[PDB]
Amino acid sequence: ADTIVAVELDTYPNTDIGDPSYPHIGIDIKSVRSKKTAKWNMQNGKVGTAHIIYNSVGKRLSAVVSYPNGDSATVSYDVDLDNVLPEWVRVGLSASTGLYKETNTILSWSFTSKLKTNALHFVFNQFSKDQKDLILQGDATTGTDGNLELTRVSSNGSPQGSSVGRALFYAPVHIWESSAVVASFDATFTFLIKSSDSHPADGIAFFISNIDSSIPSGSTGRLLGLFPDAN
């Protein structure tokens, strides 16, 4: 199976697989069952911002998710990613819907990684229809509204259920290197999760994977396009 490190913006409590009984943000290290979560007020139809930060010195993977009204949720997890991630990775965004659905629209995404310097930095503040530096997987699509639709949206604009999709940056990322004194990464994305369902589901994740990571089969819904099972 792939190796996954992720920050999940989990809109739907799957309390049967360890989700807290509210929407939450989580840090996922090789499991959809987050090593740490925080209660998250997802604001339907509002543009949220997620920032993810890690460095090899503090060894603390952190994320904050905020909306324009000031509300935010933060979660941090002490982890030495040198010991979890392959040296080379791809980085991406994933999202899913299941029985319940939502738009999992990404409006921007930036990422920086540095080994201290080697560095990779990309920023998408607009996505093209033919976003050649993105590898789209599953239902993920770009263009023509400048956004990245991680999961299926019909032409009328309504999200679809049982959808999973991801967008990986095209280039592999050298995420750690033994000679490096510091290896840091940061990611920011903005998103717009909207649903008229009974409940929104399932969420968006920023993830770091093996370079050849693919959507595991059956990873819609609770599995967020990141894992083959809920273990």
Is residue 152 a contact residue for Ca ion (CB under 5 A)? no
Of the candidate spans 2-10, 36-44, 163-171, 190-198, the one that interacts with a second copy by CB under 8 A turns out to be: 163-171
**Residue 193: CB minimum distance to a second copy, A:** 17
**Residue 115: CB minimum distance to Ca ion, A:** 32
Q: Which of 1, 39, 45, 119 binds a second copy (CB under 8 A)?
A: 119
Picked from Mn ion, Ca ion, a second copy, none, the partner binding residue 210 (CB below 5 to 8 A depending on kind) is: none
Tell me which residues touch Mn ion (CB under 5 A).
10, 19, 26
Is residue 111 a contact residue for Ca ion (CB under 5 A)? no
Is residue 10 a contact residue for Ca ion (CB under 5 A)? yes
Report the residue number, 40 or 169, with the smaller CB distance to a second copy.
169
Beta bridge partners of 25: 9, 38
Phi and psi at 223, nearest 5°, equal -95, -10
Q: Which of 33, 46, 116, 199 binds a second copy (CB under 8 A)?
A: 116
Of the candidate spans 10-18, 21-29, 173-181, 222-230, the one that interacts with a second copy by CB under 8 A turns out to be: 173-181
| C-alpha–C-alpha distance, residues 80 and 47, integer Å | 31
C-beta separation of 110 from 206 below 8 A: no
Picked from a second copy, Mn ion, Ca ion, none, the partner binding residue 116 (CB below 5 to 8 A depending on kind) is: a second copy
Q: Which of 125, 129, 196, 218 binds a second copy (CB under 8 A)?
A: 125
Count Cβ atoms within 10 A of the Cβ of residue 30 and give its class: 0-12 exposed, 13-18 middle, 19 or more buried: middle
DSSP 8-state secondary structure symbol assigned to residue 172 = -
Is residue 14 a contact residue for Ca ion (CB under 5 A)? yes
Report the residue number, 39 or 121, with the smaller CB distance to a second copy.
121
N-terminal to C-terminal alpha carbon distance within the chain: 12
C-beta separation of 12 from 97 below 8 A: no
Task: Single out the residue of 165, 221, 193 nearest to residue 13, CA to CA.
Answer: 221
Is residue 222 a contact residue for Ca ion (CB under 5 A)? yes
Name 14's Cβ contacts closer than 8 Å, sequence gap at least 6. 221, 222, 230
Helix, strand, or coil (residue 14) = coil
